[PDB]
């Protein structure tokens, strides 16, 4: 008989459990899956104690509807910062008008008591207002977050290990800050929005999963347009004539005197330019004793960085991005079409007596394990 | 021809960002105003270049188009298998 | 009303073909991603706006 705390997980661990689960390099989940069995059972403890709790256990309850909330309150105040900033100077409207589904009612009647606040007190009023109910929202959040996690009872060291605690902790000063110090502070809630979405999460990875050859590769393209600007110094000096405008208290300068400037130039202009650097230095006319010299510089630079080098790096970002397709495939087919316990394939129960259905529902269901685990860390 | 300020209002100023710097492809150094290295803040343009350079133009338009490659490809491993 | 309006016609082209449709869905079956990777570009000009 299955214990009686084992009816106090929710959902969503149940289905981290099932997708986080690693196979190790035998080729197997138990040691992983064995690993988190005391997670479980301290997190359905608390489970259990906030029954007690009617009030915590309903803010508890709600992580989708603050998350949300204080979402959509933060790219609203961020809109309505970009479009009318500076606050200074109000111009009315009044023209010769004016300007089933439950959530949708709502947001409108929300938008339109923001809107018709907005037009009557004014900018900054409404502004504060928001900022303060965003920061509200989000303590009641970060006490919900707190709540359901429950790990404030192991300690203060464990508020301090963990990053989402942390993470919450940063989003609310910045909230704070931009309700305090100055509006533009509200730009940085918008990296909120990684966090929350999980595909966008997978395309950052593209870029990060393999970051050093990327490193490696920019390193590469700085020694490339080093050693460039040094050959350009010693036999192109004169022809690093930029053009500049000077500011009252358009002429040409000369910026290749030093090679700290000769090297920032080629970086700065020859990079940035689509043509290489032969865009930014003076076209010479077919007499000059340097022609053939200029030209093939002007190619060299080109073929080697701009078509070479960036398009390695790249090419890297491809190749890092079709990986990581490639192994949540294989992760994927892998947990769909092998039982998780015995790791037997599904063609092994073709024809006989029972089938791979009802094999990984009832005599290797790993929610029985787990429930025999606990029994008998719990059972004298 | 005359010339015009655009960044007196946060909206223009996104604006001329978004549109210039964006489309252009040396980034958003080559629609402003092109300084001495006399100046103060030469070091401080030169970085904001860069930086603009290399974070959008190098980086998310070529994940936008790896996104594209990367789907593109999947459908035709797809339909090999079925 | 418009000879202008029999260009909105070229648009069965894609019905039409097979292989377009198939290059479509290139774009269409991940345009999540697509949309969010926007949406972060637009992230990025507002900051260095
Ligand atoms: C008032 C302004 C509100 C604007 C929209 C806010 C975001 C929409 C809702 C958030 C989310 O649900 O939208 C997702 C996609 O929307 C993205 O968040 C786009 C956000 C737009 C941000 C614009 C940035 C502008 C830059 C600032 C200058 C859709 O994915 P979905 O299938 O529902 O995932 C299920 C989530 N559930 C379970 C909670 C429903
Ligand atoms: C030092 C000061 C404290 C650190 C502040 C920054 C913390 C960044 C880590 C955020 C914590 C967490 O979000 O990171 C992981 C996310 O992975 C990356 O760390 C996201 C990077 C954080 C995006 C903000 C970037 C700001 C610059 C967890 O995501 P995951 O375990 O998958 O499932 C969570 C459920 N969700 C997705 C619905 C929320
Ligand atoms: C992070 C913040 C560091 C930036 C501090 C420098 C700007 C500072 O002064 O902050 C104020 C508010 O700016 C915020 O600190 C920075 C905006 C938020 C940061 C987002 C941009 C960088 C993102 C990096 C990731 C603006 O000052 P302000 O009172 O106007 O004085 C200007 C003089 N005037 C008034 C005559 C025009
Ligand atoms: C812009 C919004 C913030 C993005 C910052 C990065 C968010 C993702 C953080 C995390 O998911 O990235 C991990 C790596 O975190 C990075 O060290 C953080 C560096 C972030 C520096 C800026 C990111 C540049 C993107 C533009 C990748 O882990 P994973 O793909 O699972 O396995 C790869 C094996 N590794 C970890 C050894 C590489
Ligand atoms: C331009 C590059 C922008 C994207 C690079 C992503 C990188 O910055 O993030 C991580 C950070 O990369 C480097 O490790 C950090 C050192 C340098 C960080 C400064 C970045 C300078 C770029 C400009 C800012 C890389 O992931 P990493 O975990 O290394 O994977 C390799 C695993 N190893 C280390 C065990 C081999
Ligand atoms: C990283 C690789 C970088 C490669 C960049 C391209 C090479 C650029 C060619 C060198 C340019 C210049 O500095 O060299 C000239 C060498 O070229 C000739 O001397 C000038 C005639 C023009 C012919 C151009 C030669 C192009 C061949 C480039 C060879 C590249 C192969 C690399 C060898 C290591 C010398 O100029 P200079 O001495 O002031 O003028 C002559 C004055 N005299 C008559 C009194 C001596
Ligand atoms: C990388 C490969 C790039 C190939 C370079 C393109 C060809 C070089 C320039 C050709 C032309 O511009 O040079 C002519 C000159 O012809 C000769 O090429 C110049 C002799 C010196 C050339 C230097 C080396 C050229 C070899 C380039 C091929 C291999 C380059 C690989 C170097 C790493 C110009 O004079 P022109 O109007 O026509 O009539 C000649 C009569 N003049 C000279 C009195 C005017
Ligand atoms: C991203 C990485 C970009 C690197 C920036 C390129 C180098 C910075 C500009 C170098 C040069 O232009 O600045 C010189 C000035 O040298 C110093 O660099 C200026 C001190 C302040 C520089 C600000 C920070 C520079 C550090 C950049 C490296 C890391 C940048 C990463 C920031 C995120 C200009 O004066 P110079 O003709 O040569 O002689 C000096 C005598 N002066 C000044 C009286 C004229
Ligand atoms: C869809 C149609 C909406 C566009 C209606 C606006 C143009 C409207 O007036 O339609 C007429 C016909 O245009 C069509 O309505 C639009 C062309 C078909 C739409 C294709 C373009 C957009 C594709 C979007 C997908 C053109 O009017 P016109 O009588 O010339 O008046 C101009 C004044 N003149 C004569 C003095 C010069
Ligand atoms: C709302 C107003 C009514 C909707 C008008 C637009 C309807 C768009 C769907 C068209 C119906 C059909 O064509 O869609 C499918 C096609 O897939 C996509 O929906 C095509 C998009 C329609 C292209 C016109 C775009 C106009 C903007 C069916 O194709 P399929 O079942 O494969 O086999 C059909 C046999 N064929 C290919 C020889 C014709
Ligand atoms: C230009 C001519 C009209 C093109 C419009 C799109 C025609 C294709 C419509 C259809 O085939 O696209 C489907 C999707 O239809 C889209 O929702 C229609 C949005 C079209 C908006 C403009 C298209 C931008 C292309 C430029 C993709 O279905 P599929 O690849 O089978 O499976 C992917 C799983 N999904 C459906 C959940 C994503
Ligand atoms: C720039 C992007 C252009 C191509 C994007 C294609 C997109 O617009 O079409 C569909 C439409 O994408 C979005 O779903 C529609 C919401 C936003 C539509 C407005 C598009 C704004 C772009 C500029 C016009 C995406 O397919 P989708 O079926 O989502 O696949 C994900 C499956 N989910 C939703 C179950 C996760
Ligand atoms: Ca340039
Ligand atoms: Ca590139
Ligand atoms: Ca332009
Ligand atoms: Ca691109
Ligand atoms: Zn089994």
């Known amino acids: ?104 009612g709502i947001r409108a009647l929300i938008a339109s008591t923001i809107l018709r606040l907005i037009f009557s007190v004014g900018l900054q009023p409404t502004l504060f207002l928001l900022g303060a109910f965003n920061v509200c929202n989000k303590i009641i959040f970060l006490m919900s977050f707190v709540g359901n996690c429950g790990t404030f009872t192991r300690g203060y060291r464990a508020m301090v290990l963990d990053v989402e605690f942390l993470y919450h902790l940063l989003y609310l000063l910045i909230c704070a800050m931009g309700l305090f110090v100055h509006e533009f502070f509200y730009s940085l809630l918008l990296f909120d929005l990684v966090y929350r979405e999980e595909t966008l999460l997978n395309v950052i990875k593209s870029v990060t999963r393999n970051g050093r050859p990327i490193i490696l590769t920019a390193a590469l393209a700085l020694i490339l347009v080093y050693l460039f600007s040094i050959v350009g110094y010693l036999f192109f000096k004169d022809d690093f004539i930029l053009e500049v405008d000077r500011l009252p208290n358009q002429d040409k300068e000369h910026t290749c005197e030093t090679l700290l400037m000769c090297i920032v130039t080629v970086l700065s202009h020859g990079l940035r330019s689509g043509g290489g650097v032969g865009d930014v230095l003076r076209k010479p006319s077919k007499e000059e004793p340097l022609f053939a010299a200029r030209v093939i510089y002007d190619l060299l630079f080109f073929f080697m960085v701009i078509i070479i080098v960036l398009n390695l790096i790249f090419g890297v970002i491809i190749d890092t991005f079709a990986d990581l397709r490639s192994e949540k495939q294989k992760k994927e087919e892998i947990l769909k079409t092998t039982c998780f316990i015995c790791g037997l394939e599904r063609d092994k129960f073709d024809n006989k007596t029972v089938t791979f259905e009802e094999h990984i529902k009832e005599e290797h269901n790993m929610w029985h394990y787990l429930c025999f685990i606990v029994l008998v860390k719990v059972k004298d």
């Open 1 to 104: 008989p299955v214990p009686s705390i084992c009816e106090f997980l929710t959902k969503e661990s149940k289905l981290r459990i099932y997708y986080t689960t690693e196979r190790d390099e035998q080729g197997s989940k138990i040691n992983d899956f064995f690993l988190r069995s005391e997670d479980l059972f301290n997190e359905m403890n608390w489970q259990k104690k906030l029954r007690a709790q009617p009030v915590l256990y309903w803010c508890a309850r709600n992580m989708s509807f603050w998350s949300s909330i204080s979402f959509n309150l933060a790219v609203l105040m961020n809109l309505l910062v970009a479009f009318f900033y500076p606050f200074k100077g109000v111009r009315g409207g009044t023209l010769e008008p004016h300007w089933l589904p439950k959530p949708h």
